[PDB]
Curated annotation (Swiss-Prot):
Record function comment: Thrombin inhibitor activated by the glycosaminoglycans, heparin or dermatan sulfate. In the presence of the latter, HC-II becomes the predominant thrombin inhibitor in place of antithrombin III (AT-III). Also inhibits chymotrypsin, but in a glycosaminoglycan-independent manner. Peptides at the N-terminal of HC-II have chemotactic activity for both monocytes and neutrophils.
Full protein name: Heparin cofactor 2
Residues of the full protein shown: 189 to 212 of 499
Tissue: Expressed predominantly in liver. Also present in plasma.
Domain notes: The N-terminal acidic repeat region mediates, in part, the glycosaminoglycan-accelerated thrombin inhibition.
Gene: SERPIND1
Post-translational modification: Phosphorylated by FAM20C in the extracellular medium.
Region span, Glycosaminoglycan-binding site: 4-24
Family, per entry: Belongs to the serpin family.
Record: disease: Thrombophilia due to heparin cofactor 2 deficiency: A hemostatic disorder characterized by a tendency to recurrent thrombosis.
Length: 24
């Protein structure tokens, strides 16, 4: 992902959901 620059914005708060996504 090279356009991560547009994701880092929410990626700072989405990381909390990933713990439930990737895991479930």
């Amino acid at each position: 992902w090279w356009w991560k620059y547009e994701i880092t914005t929410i990626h700072n708060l989405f990381r909390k959901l990933t713990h439930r996504l990737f895991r479930r």
